[PDB]
C-alpha cells in the first residue's frame, strides 16, 4: 500500500517526533533511541508494515517507557506485550498504518533487529543447528554448556558472529 520511501519518511518523522510522559516528566524519543526495522530494514518495493526498535538503558525504564506515549502531529494506539513487544497503529486523519515496535535494553539491541528481520524461521534453524553444539539463543541471551552468555556486541552482524554462525542481509527475512 505504501512505498519504500513512504515508510522511511513516516518512521523517520515518527522517531523524530515521539514523546512520552513518565511520572509527570516528558521523555522524548529520537533516532538515537529508535531504530527502523522490518520493511525499512528489508527495503523492498512496497511498504505494508513498518517495524521499529527502541532501546532502553534500564529495565525499569523499559517497563515504564510506555506510560503516557504521545506523537506530535499524528494519532496512534500502542499495545504492550511481553518484554520487548509493542504493537501500535498510527492514524493520519482517518488513515491507519501498522507499526510494530520492540522495546529492548541497550544490550538487547542486536537480538531485537535479529528477531525483527528474521521472522523466526532463520532463528529456528540457527537455534536447532546451534543446539547440537550446545548453543541456545534466548530473548535473554545465549546459553552454552549451561552457561548464560549475553550478546556482548554492537550490531546484528556482530551478534550473529558471536553466536558462531553465518550472518546474512536483513533483506533476506527468513
Swiss-Prot record:
Any extra remark in the record?
Answer: Consistent with its intracellular location, ASFV encodes its own replicative DNA polymerase and three base excision repair enzymes: a class II AP endonuclease, the repair polymerase Pol X, and an ATP-dependent DNA ligase.
Gene Ontology cellular-component annotations: virion component
Disulphide bridges: 81-86
Q: Which organism is it from?
A: African swine fever virus (strain Badajoz 1971 Vero-adapted) (Ba71V)
* UniProt site (Stabilizes dGTP in a syn conformation to overcome the Watson-Crick base pairing constraint): 115
This chain belongs to the protein called Repair DNA polymerase X
Q: Which residues bind Mg(2+)?
A: 49, 51, 100
Which family does this protein fall into? Belongs to the DNA polymerase type-X family.
- Give me the reactions it catalyses: DNA(n) + a 2'-deoxyribonucleoside 5'-triphosphate = DNA(n+1) + diphosphate
UniProt remark on domains: Small DNA polymerase formed from only a palm and a C-terminal subdomain. Unlike other polymerases, binds DNA via the helix alphaE. The total DNA-binding site of pol X is composed of two DNA-binding subsites.
Keywords (alphabetical) are:
Disulfide bond, DNA damage, DNA repair, DNA-binding, DNA-directed DNA polymerase, Magnesium, Metal-binding, Nucleotidyltransferase, Transferase, Virion
Described purpose of this protein according to its UniProt entry:
Error-prone polymerase lacking a proofreading 3'-5' exonuclease which catalyzes the gap-filling reaction during the DNA repair process. Specifically binds intermediates in the single-nucleotide base-excision repair process. Also catalyzes DNA polymerization with low nucleotide-insertion fidelity. Probably acts as a strategic DNA mutase, which gives rise to a rapid emergence of variants. Generates mismatched G-G pairs, in that case, the polymerase first binds the deoxynucleotide followed by mismatch formation.
Q: Where is this region: Involved in ssDNA binding?
A: 42-51
Pfam families associated with the record? DNA_pol_B_thumb, NTP_transf_2
Per its UniProt entry, which superkingdom is the organism in? Viruses
Q: Which consequence is recorded for altering residue 115 to A?
A: Complete loss of MgdGTP binding and dG:dGTP ternary complex formation but not dG:dCTP ternary complex formation
A single Gene Ontology biological process assigned to it is:
double-strand break repair via nonhomologous end joining
